[PDB]
């Protein structure tokens, strides 16, 4: 994935998720994409209530992009693999 200031454009299914989380722009940095993904998971309460590094994304649009039913924030590879598939590097 690109570095700090590099700009990216999310593909449509990812952009829709970011829009749910309040994003009004079409171009982001990777860190800004991660900000809105965290916002989305937080607002929808997809994290496990007891063990909050675990995210349950099955049956949610986010799981369709991640291709997994759950993931750990401390094992973020599925997130970054999804971003590689869903970001156009500008």
């Amino acid at each position: 994935l690109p570095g700090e200031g590099t700009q990216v454009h999310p593909r449509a299914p990812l952009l829709q998720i970011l829009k749910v989380a309040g994003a009004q722009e079409e171009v982001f940095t990777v860190k800004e994409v991660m900000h809105y993904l965290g916002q989305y998971i937080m607002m929808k309460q997809l994290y496990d209530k007891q063990r909050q590094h675990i995210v349950h994304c099955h049956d949610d649009p986010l799981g369709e992009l991640l291709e997994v039913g759950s993931f750990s924030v401390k094992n973020p590879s599925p997130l970054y693999e999804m971003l590689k598939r869903n970001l156009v590097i500008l």
Binding site: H35, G38, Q52, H53
Partner: peptide
């Protein structure tokens, strides 16, 4: 007992 907001922020900023 850390919150999702702090755990995600630690990753985002790393």
């Amino acid at each position: 007992q850390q919150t999702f907001x702090n755990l995600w922020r630690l990753e985002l900023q790393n």
